[PDB]
Amino acid sequence: SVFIFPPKTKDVLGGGLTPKVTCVVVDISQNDPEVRFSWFIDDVEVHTAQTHAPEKQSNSTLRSVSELPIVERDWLNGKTFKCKVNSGAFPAPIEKSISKPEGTPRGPQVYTMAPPKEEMTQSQVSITCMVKGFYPPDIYTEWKMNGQPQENYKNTPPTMDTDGSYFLYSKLNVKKETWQQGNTFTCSVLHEGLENEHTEKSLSH
Amino acid sequence: SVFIFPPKTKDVLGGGLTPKVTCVVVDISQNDPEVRFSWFIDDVEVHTAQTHAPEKQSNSTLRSVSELPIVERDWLNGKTFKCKVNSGAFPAPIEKSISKPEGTPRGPQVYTMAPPKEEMTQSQVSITCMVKGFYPPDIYTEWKMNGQPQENYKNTPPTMDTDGSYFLYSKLNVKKETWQQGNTFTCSVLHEGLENEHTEKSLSH
Ligand SMILES: *[C@@H]1O[C@H](CO[C@H]2O[C@@H](C)[C@@H](O)[C@@H](O)[C@@H]2O)[C@@H](O[C@@H]2O[C@H](CO)[C@@H](O[C@@H]3O[C@H](CO[C@H]4O[C@H](CO)[C@@H](O)[C@H](O)[C@@H]4O[C@@H]4O[C@H](CO)[C@@H](O)[C@H](O)[C@H]4NC(C)=O)[C@@H](O)[C@H](O[C@H]4O[C@H](CO)[C@@H](O)[C@H](O)[C@@H]4O[C@@H]4O[C@H](CO)[C@@H](O)[C@H](O)[C@H]4NC(C)=O)[C@@H]3O)[C@H](O)[C@H]2NC(C)=O)[C@H](O)[C@H]1NC(C)=O
Numbered sequence: 001s002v003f004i005f006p007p008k009t010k011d012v013l014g015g016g017l018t019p020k021v022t023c024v025v026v027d028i029s030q031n032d033p034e035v036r037f038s039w040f041i042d043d044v045e046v047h048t049a050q051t052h053a054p055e056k057q058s059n060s061t062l063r064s065v066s067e068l069p070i071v072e073r074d075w076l077n078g079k080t081f082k083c084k085v086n087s088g089a090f091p092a093p094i095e096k097s098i099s100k101p102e103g104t105p106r107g108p109q110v111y112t113m114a115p116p117k118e119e120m121t122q123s124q125v126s127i128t129c130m131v132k133g134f135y136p137p138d139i140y141t142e143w144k145m146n147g148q149p150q151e152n153y154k155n156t157p158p159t160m161d162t163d164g165s166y167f168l169y170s171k172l173n174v175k176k177e178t179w180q181q182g183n184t185f186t187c188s189v190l191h192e193g194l195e196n197e198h199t200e201k202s203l204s205h
Numbered sequence: 206s207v208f209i210f211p212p213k214t215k216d217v218l219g220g221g222l223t224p225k226v227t228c229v230v231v232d233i234s235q236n237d238p239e240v241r242f243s244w245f246i247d248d249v250e251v252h253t254a255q256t257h258a259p260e261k262q263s264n265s266t267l268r269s270v271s272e273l274p275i276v277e278r279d280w281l282n283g284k285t286f287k288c289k290v291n292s293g294a295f296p297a298p299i300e301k302s303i304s305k306p307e308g309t310p311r312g313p314q315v316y317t318m319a320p321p322k323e324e325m326t327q328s329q330v331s332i333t334c335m336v337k338g339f340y341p342p343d344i345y346t347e348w349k350m351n352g353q354p355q356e357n358y359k360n361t362p363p364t365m366d367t368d369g370s371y372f373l374y375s376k377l378n379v380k381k382e383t384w385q386q387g388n389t390f391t392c393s394v395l396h397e398g399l400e401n402e403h404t405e406k407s408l409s410h
Pocket residue numbers: 001003005006022024025026027057058059061063
């Protein structure tokens with residue numbers, strides 16, 4: 001079984017690293033783990049891919065990962081990425097393709113919320129960011145304080161809403177002090193449906 | 206092929222019906238659907254299980270479901286439930302086991318938050334419930350209004366936090382009116398780590 005995955009929104013929209021199409025091969029005969037990857041962009045093979053050694057899983061099977069570094073434009077422009085894997089011990093080569101979705105986009109609304117009053121009794125408080133009404137569910141969310149990106153926050157997976165769109169919450173955990181000191185906290189969101197692909201929302205005490 | 210499933214959190218934490226470990230058998234030869242189930246609790250067979258007749262699926266294969274009614278304590282206490290199924294037309298008996306995920310419990314803290322000020326311009330608003338610091342990630346969350354459970358809300362999957370515990374948000378969607386009218390909204394949570402396995406938190410305009 002071969003699974004292919006799209007690039008990360010953060011990466012595709014310059015918000016970070018180099019974008020990559022990832023191809024994962026599971027259920028590999030512990031006997032013949034000599035799997036080979038062949039990547040194509042609209043059926044033209046490329047050799048810039050980087051394949052990783054296989055790893056053992058609980059079920060004594062193996063797993064191999066290959067990453068094709070790509071250009072943000074090729075993806076946004078709808079080109080098809082094809083990863084062809086011939087097990088060498090398999091009857092026939094296995095293929096999987098992928099490209100930017102095609103379904104109708106909807107940018108989300110972004111709201112930031114202060115720590116609930118009751119939590120103020122704690123030594124650590126939560127700064128919440130609500131991101132709702134978006135589609136597709138490919139998105140990127142991070143927290144900043146005084147312009148500096150933060151490490152202590154987590155995003156919930158995009159969740160399906162009653163109206164068909166997705167929503168999610170991002171929680172930044174900070175010491176009570178830090179919130180009271182009045183630093184500026186900014187919720188940053190990257191989505192194709194936003195004007196200029198992103199929106200920032202700030203708040204302070 | 207066989208699959209085993211844990212009891213429902215609602216049921217395990219008294220919030221409802223009788224808890225049950227479910228064992229599902231798929232890909233059954235339409236020829237020999239005389240499948241037999243054998244249940245064990247720490248390798249001691251029991252006969253309180255209830256097996257259902259097999260059903261046909263699109264792929265002309267069959268599926269059988271067996272349900273072992275259990276006691277809330279046996280599960281919370283970490284006992285192992287084992288379901289052994291010998292197809293009778295299969296080479297060997299197939300087994301699958303299960304037990305409460307692992308380790309030391311931690312009840313969560315529950316906070317409710319009003320709709321963000323900016324959202325008040327909308328015709329529909331969000332009442333938020335933050336549930337953080339819990340483990341294991343087996344939990345149950347629902348919303349009520351004036352004591353009546355509500356349909357229009359959604360829970361995000363439990364998310365892994367930086368400290369090792371899980372957190373999640375539950376969003377109740379209501380018409381602006383409903384929030385302004387001053388009805389009481391209650392966030393109800395069931396977790397083994399809470400005193401009496403649950404906590405409720407209310408709020409209003
Ligand atoms: C032996 O062990 C192997 C590994 O052991 C571990 O497995 C994991 C899963 C867990 O059980 C551990 O306890 C084990 O130790 C087993 O390998 C697994 O095999 C299963 C197959 O049953 C694979 O499942 C597939 O998963 C993809 C999604 O993959 C992402 O999400 C996974 C869940 O969290 C995650 O584990 C993966 O790593 C992966 O994560 C992403 O990874 C990329 C890069 O790698 C990152 O960039 C992402 O950020 C990251 N995401 C994040 C964040 O987590 C899933 O899509 C597959 O489902 C599709 O196909 C099914 C076909 O069977 C179908 O039934 C589904 O409905 C679904 O179909 C799609 O549906 C959508 C809409 O719903 C349509 O739009 C699509 O068109 C449609 N596509 C089609 C045509 O299918 C599938 O469930 C699992 O990924 C793999 N583990 C990994 C990881 O490699 C092995 O199975 C086991 N063998 C035995 C003996 O059983």
